RNA sequence: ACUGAAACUGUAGUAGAACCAAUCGGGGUCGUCAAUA
């Protein structure tokens, strides 16, 4: 059988357009949405921070509400029961 | 003379080891005070 495409198109999730409009021009705030999280491996013997395993990861602040546009290109003959299966 | 499809930048990793908020100190004890006329 030929490979089936998806019925569902899912966009990227972006911040609310008014919130992104507020960030325009504010490079300092644009960086401030994220902060450094440290990570370090500990030596299982000596119990000490294993140097050059010290690590900083950028993480984005919790509370973000992001939204993606979804398109369901369902088959036009699809049974109403099968619609409920997909929705389910 | 006709949009490829489909695919999680994820997986493992303790911001930690070491460092005394501490050193010294009797809750004690005796000579005046004042400057003019």
Residue A10, φ and ψ in degrees, nearest 5: -120, 120
Resolution in Å, one decimal, please.
2.5
- What does the block give as tokens for A46? 């000596």
Pinpoint the alpha helices (H) of A8-48.
17-22, 27-32
Q: How was this structure determined?
A: cryo-EM
Rounded Cα gap, residues A26 and A32, in angstroms? 10
Nearest nucleotide (CA of A42 to C1'): B14
Rounded Cα gap, residues A78 and A88, in angstroms? 15
Place of tokens 């950028």: A58
CA torsion sign for A18, A20, A25, A31 is positive
Please tell me what DSSP assigns to residue A7.
S
CA torsion sign for A12, A16, A21, A25 is negative
CB A15 within 8 A of CB A66: yes
Q: Cα A65 from chain centroid?
A: 10
Nearest nucleotide (CA of A8 to C1'): B6
Rounded Cα gap, residues A41 and A47, in angstroms? 9
């Amino acid at each position: 059988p030929e490979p089936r495409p998806a019925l569902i198109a899912i966009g990227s999730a972006h911040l609310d357009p008014k919130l992104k409009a507020a960030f325009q021009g504010k490079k300092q705030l644009q960086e401030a949405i994220a902060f450094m999280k440290p990570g370090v491996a500990i030596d299982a013997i000596t119990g000490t921070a294993k140097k050059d395993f010290l690590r900083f990861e950028e993480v984005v602040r919790l509370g973000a509400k992001l939204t993606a546009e979804v398109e369901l290109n369902l088959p036009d003959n699809l049974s109403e029961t099968n619609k409920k299966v997909i929705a389910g």
